[PDB]
């Protein structure tokens, strides 16, 4: 469950948040494959509640109605078509598995669901599964409200309803079996693994029993004995009875401390500075590198109300964001996930973005297709951070330097830092309020290297800045603090 199962030499996954299956299938072929992306995390592919107030929020996808593969992203045929086409070009699909719960307990009964299945929350009835009252934790939960009220009590966090979400009785084999059934369908179609939603709200043991029933990955694309890559969503910044480490037995775990600290550092808040990143990783209290799923931001916290709060960097803060994402992708700690977002009408009323619920670009509820501009950015209010040159090139940087050690670290005691990855890559950052002009040991073979932040290597030349590494591995870097992208990166495959 720890192996990503990506093609050899692909090291990142991208979250194509709320994208339609047909758009992801094309993206695999036209972009993710040739640019070296390892795979895609998709939004939950199972039927969910169609929430009409507010109008089709992003959060309705976290309220299952059944396990039919039928959502605004598309139907089962389109899902299968996407998984096949992506696998056929060496790009994996990872499914967002929402298995802790069904929908909100106060949602109205009816067929307001993305595949038209009937369900009745009040009576605990989901016949398209089917699940009935006996399949929920109503009788196990000990709080007066039936909901989670106190995070200091690990059992209620597991047995009670998260904000009213009907809590499945994962201790039961029948329930374990229906979820496994769904996950196996996905596995056999060709899925490489799963993001396990709301893992904190489930006993590590129940997750185990569910995973125990899973098939090996599809033997047309994956070697014999292959197991689904598992990464569990647990937000753990310390101070609670539940710990990320409680889930290591099942797979990787999201390391939410990662983006929270990095965002603090790059913004230079709370006394933090880049030179402190020299012992980035376990040195900062993070979980072991081999269990961490890292990211600068995710679909929840980019809206500003995750544990990292306001310190989380996003596409809205593009300049600092690119740098944070670049630092992440260059650094060997963890397995990296890059965010890909859509724009929404962000509106703050004293502290909250009252539009943080807004779903993807849409025409009356129908998700818009992703259009590609001539310069390869996206239209239809899809941000496509993964297509920004500065990020896309760093995705390749990580592939190029895979397995090389963190080395040749430099810092000026403030916010000018640099480091290498063995003899295959080197990156330099200026986050101080004056220019960074200095000759540095890069660890690389002598030559002329294209900076892949400023530009690209194409046909024996560079479209951007050129860095000259001499016989002793040293190179001069000059980065003005007024640079729009105040960082440079070069690697073995950007050498002329
Ligand atoms: Ca639960
Ligand atoms: Cl996540």
Swiss-Prot record:
Glycans are attached at residues 412, 461. Gene3D superfamilies: Glycosidases, Golgi alpha-mannosidase II. Chloride binds at residues 195, 298, 337. The gene is AMY1A. The record marks 300 as: Transition state stabilizer. Calcium-binding enzyme that initiates starch digestion in the oral cavity. Catalyzes the hydrolysis of internal (1->4)-alpha-D-glucosidic bonds, yielding a mixture of maltose, isomaltose, small amounts of glucose as well as small linear and branched oligosaccharides called dextrins. This is Alpha-amylase 1A. InterPro entries: A-amylase/branching_C, A-amylase_C, Alpha_amylase, Glyco_hydro_13_cat_dom, Glyco_hydro_b, Glycoside_hydrolase_SF.
